Structures are given as structure tokens and as C-alpha cells.
Design a protein around this ligand. Structure first.
Ligand SMILES: *[C@@H]1O[C@H](CO)[C@@H](O[C@@H]2O[C@H](CO)[C@@H](O)[C@H](O)[C@H]2NC(C)=O)[C@H](O)[C@H]1NC(C)=O
Length: 32
């Protein structure tokens, strides 16, 4: 077992905005 340093001292996790409709793009690179 190894040690991965000290734990995080943050009092709050980060805030995000999830919009999956903006990430749907038609870029196809199929395997050839
Ligand atoms: C950054 O991450 C590395 C990787 O875990 C930390 O290195 C460890 O530090 C602890 C502190 O006691 C040691 O016990 C481990 O042996 C170290 N592991 C390695 C692979 O180096 C490092 O402390 C971290 N730095 C900060 C500032 O969090």
C-alpha cells in the first residue's frame, strides 16, 4: 500500500452545468 499525499481540504465541490444537447455533434471517424 502506498500513500497518495494529504487529502483535500476544500469545503465545497466545484459547480458544473450539464447540457448534453450541446455536445451531440455529427463527427464520424469510423474504423478503416
Ligand atoms: C502529489 O502527489 C504525490 C503522489 O502521491 C505525493 O507523493 C506522495 O507523498 C506522500 C506524503 O507522505 C508520500 O508518503 C508518498 O510516498 C509520495 N508518493 C510518491 C509516489 O511520491 C505528493 O505528496 C503530492 N503532493 C501534494 C502537495 O499533495
Amino acid at each position: 500500500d502506498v500513500d497518495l499525499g494529504p487529502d483535500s481540504s476544500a469545503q465545497s465541490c466545484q459547480e458544473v452545468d450539464i447540457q448534453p444537447q450541446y455536445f451531440q455533434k455529427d463527427w464520424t471517424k469510423p474504423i478503416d
